[PDB]
Amino acid sequence: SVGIVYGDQYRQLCCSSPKFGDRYALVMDLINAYKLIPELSRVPPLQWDSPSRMYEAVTAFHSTEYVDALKKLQMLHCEEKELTADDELLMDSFSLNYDCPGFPSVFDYSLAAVQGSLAAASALICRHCEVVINWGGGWHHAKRSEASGFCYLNDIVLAIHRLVSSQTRVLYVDLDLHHGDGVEEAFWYSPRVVTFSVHHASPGFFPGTGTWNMLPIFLNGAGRGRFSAFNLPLEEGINDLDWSNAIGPILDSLNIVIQPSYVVVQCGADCLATDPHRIFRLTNFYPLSGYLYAIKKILSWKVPTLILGGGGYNFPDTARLWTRVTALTIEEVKGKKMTISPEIPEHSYFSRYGPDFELDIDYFPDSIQKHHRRILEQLRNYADLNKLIYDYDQVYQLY
Ligand SMILES: O=C(/C=C/c1ccccc1Cl)NO
Ligand SMILES: [K+]
Ligand SMILES: [K+]
Ligand SMILES: [Zn+2]
């Protein structure tokens, strides 16, 4: 059974931010326009019995003062007096500024993604769904007491924390163009949550982490979590096939050696060739899309899986991609062919898909070898440190 997180309130809140506007509404309407909803189990966002229970849930990761600050930021943007100097300084100490501005619904908006991904985790734990999709979640940059990259609350960390706390191991796979620093940082000392992020990194590129550190080396966890944080930084321009070749053997080896109880996939869409970032050249093509390749491989493991959204700034193209990921998930889990018309069906947001209105995004197309050796060695070190039973010939064979 494949779940998907949505709801009427949930939709309004996910579409209330200045940065991502109505992206979520395009995504869910396209999924709906392709008639996939009847195939999917609706998963309602989690709600709480009281303010105290909500605070308890969220401060599982975030500090109480940060949460307080985030709530006050909302109240302040709901009045039209300027913030006092004192309020500005409080907000600054939490990076609630610049690229993480306040807006009238900023706490409700951020909390929604958390409600969504907590319900997704619970649906997996109680075995109601084999896979749950939350395209309203995926905010991997938020820290304990710090907003970052328009992430205010880290819904992924909270979902993952709920999963491990239910010999439980979680594999977190971050496909976003950006390094999943928040999630990685959160589980830096935890061997039972292995994080793996593939991303672009270059000097000055957000957020700066997930690459060689200041010959220099890769940090990879600490304490009992040593060797438990995996990173593959790629240079710009990479396409579907090279991207797929770069991460394929790593995903497979991670699964084999770690044997996770849950997989949590962040599927931020800013790797698309047509994203305004224009760094990687991935597509949503399904004849092959790096995304669809990675998700299919992960789903072939038959491990209960959380699939989340994230970045993606070309809203129709993000919708095009996540519609195909959603179709792919249904087909792989329920074992039934999903046929999708090559052109966008008429629906409320049909016009946004110009000019050609088809489902493919409008695009025509040794360093990695060093990384594989480096990571296999980290995986071996991880396995050794944690006394796991790995077959070194089979893992090595994958490369
Ligand atoms: O999409 C992202 C980050 C986007 C970003 C980066 C730097 C500054 C602001 C933003 Cl929204 N990562 O998930
Ligand atoms: K990533
Ligand atoms: K870890
Ligand atoms: Zn991103």
Q: How far apart are CA 294 and CA 43, in angstroms?
A: 24
Q: How far apart are CA 140 and CA 378, in angstroms?
A: 23
Residue ranges lining ligand 1, Cβ < 6 Å: 19, 99, 140-141, 149-150, 176, 178, 206, 268, 270, 310-311
- Give the ligand with the smallest distance to the CA of 310: 1
Cis peptide before 355 (omega within 30 of 0): yes
Q: Which of 62, 128, 140, 141 is the catalytic position? A: 141
Please report, in range form, the residues annotated as the binding site.
Answer: 176, 178, 270
Is-contact 154 183, C-beta < 8 A?
yes
- Give the ligand with the smallest distance to the CA of 169: 3
CA of 200 to the centre of ligand 2 (A): 8
Which residues, in sequence order, are CB contacts of 117 under 8 Å at separation 6+? 5, 134, 137, 155, 156, 158, 159, 306, 308
Resolution expressed in Å: 2.1
CA of 98 to the centre of ligand 1 (A): 12
Give me the torsion for CA of 355, 281, 209, 376, rounded to 10°.
140
Please report, in range form, the residues annotated as the binding site for Zn(2+).
Answer: 176, 178, 270
Say how many CA atoms lie within 13 Å of 96 toward its Cβ: 29
State both tokens at 207: 């957020």
Q: Whose CA is nearest to atom 1 of ligand 1?
A: 311
Which residues, in sequence order, are CB contacts of 37 under 8 Å at separation 6+? 4, 31
Q: Whose CA is nearest to atom 13 of ligand 1?
A: 311
Domain annotation for the chain: domains and CATH numbers:
1-399 (3.40.800.20)
**Residues 173, 177, 183, 187, CA torsion sign:** positive
Which position has the token pair 């979640």?
137
Q: Which residues of 240-269 are buried (b: 16+ CB within 10 A; e: fewer)?
A: beebbebbbbbbbbbbbbbebbbbbbbbbb
Q: How far apart are CA 238 and CA 261, in angstroms?
A: 31
Q: How far apart are CA 150 and CA 18, in angstroms?
A: 10
CA of 311 to the centre of ligand 4 (A): 4
CA of 247 to the centre of ligand 3 (A): 18
